[PDB]
């Protein structure tokens, strides 16, 4: 529909918003009837679906992913936290 072009092919080692989105789709595609063993496989099968997501979504997956790796890296143990924040709409002009 009315939407520009976005998304570029790039196999990143670290799990990024895109990686997280595919991970939660790996088992989803398997049932559909597609050869998907791991993310790398569900990468392309989820290239058009990812483009459908909205900036807000992309940022969400990228945020949870970044914080996940940071918390998982800095320390070998688990670590979850977040602050109650909610804001939408431009505040310029």
UniProtKB/Swiss-Prot annotation:
Residues annotated as DNA-binding are 11-80
Q: In which tissues is it expressed?
A: Testis-specific. Expressed in various cancer cell lines, probably due to demethylation of its promoter.
Q: Where in the cell is it found?
A: Cytoplasm; Nucleus
Indicate the segments annotated as coiled coil, or none if absent: none
Q: Which domain of life is it from?
A: Eukaryota
> Its biological function?
Plays a central role during spermatogenesis by repressing transposable elements and preventing their mobilization, which is essential for the germline integrity. Acts via the piRNA metabolic process, which mediates the repression of transposable elements during meiosis by forming complexes composed of piRNAs and Piwi proteins and governs the methylation and subsequent repression of transposons. Its association with piP-bodies suggests a participation in the secondary piRNAs metabolic process. Required for the localization of germ-cell factors to the meiotic nuage.
Q: Which family does it belong to?
A: Belongs to the maelstrom family.
Summary of subunit composition and partner proteins? Interacts with SMARCB1, SIN3B and DDX4. Interacts with piRNA-associated proteins TDRD1, PIWIL1 and PIWIL2. Interacts with TEX19.
Protein name, as recorded: Protein maelstrom homolog
Organism of origin? Homo sapiens
Tell me the organism's taxonomic lineage.
Eukaryota, Metazoa, Chordata, Craniata, Vertebrata
The gene that this protein is the product of is MAEL
């Amino acid at each position: 529909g009315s939407s520009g072009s976005s998304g570029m092919p790039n196999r990143k080692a670290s799990r990024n918003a895109y990686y997280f989105f595919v991970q939660e789709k790996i088992p989803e595609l398997r049932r559909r009837g597609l050869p998907v063993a791991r993310v790398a496989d569900a990468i392309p099968y989820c290239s058009s679906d990812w483009a459908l997501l909205r900036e807000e979504e992309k940022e969400k997956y990228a945020e949870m992913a970044r914080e996940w790796r940071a918390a998982q890296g800095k320390d070998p143990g688990p670590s979850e936290k977040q602050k109650p924040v909610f804001t939408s709409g431009p505040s310029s002009g």
